[PDB]
Each structure stands twice: as structure tokens, then as C-alpha cells.
Assembly symmetry: D2
Homo-oligomer: 29 residues x 4
């Protein structure tokens, strides 16, 4: 899985880069 | 992101297939 | 990268499953 | 598939970034 480790807040996966997922702490990972 | 539509429980991401991740509700997605 | 190893002929990546790519021998990989 | 738009030569897939693969023409893609 490709998820650059850029710190980004999110509500949905579409708020995230690449194949990062929106995790339960409100950040992409 | 490639995450099969297979119902799987998980404690860690490693429990999941492909690029699915372990969500805190206790299932892969 | 997620590429199921199902034998499939191709001309383009869109002929392939998942994140398989169309390789120079004419099969997905 | 996540393959950065970065010009890279390669002898093997391992030479490439992310989910890029080594094409026989000698570049990642
Ligand atoms: Zn991927």
C-alpha cells in the first residue's frame, strides 16, 4: 500500500493522498 | 486502493488482505 | 502492489486485474 | 496503481518507486 506519511487531517479517504486511509484519530494513514 | 470485498475481522493491519487496513470497529476495510 | 497471478493476455494495463501491468510478453504481471 | 511521475531507469522492479514496475525499454512506469 502506498501512503506518503504527510500529516493530513481527514474525514474520508478522499481527503488523503495516494492509498492513505482516514483513520479514527482524524488523520490519514 | 485494492481491498477485496471480503468480511474479515482484525486486530492489526496484518490480519487484512491486500491493501485493506484494520479499522478500530474491528473489521478490515 | 496488488496483482493476482491469474494468467491473462493483454495489450494495455486496463486489460488486467487490480494493479497488474501489461508486460512485454503479452501477459499481465 | 500508484506510480510517481519520476524519470527513473531500472534493471529490476526493485529499482523503481512505489508501484512502478521496470519496463523492458529500461525505465520505470
Ligand atoms: Zn496499491
Amino acid at each position: 500500500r502506498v501512503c506518503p506519511r504527510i500529516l493530513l487531517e481527514c474525514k474520508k479517504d478522499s481527503d488523503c493522498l495516494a492509498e492513505c486511509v482516514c483513520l479514527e484519530h482524524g488523520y490519514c494513514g
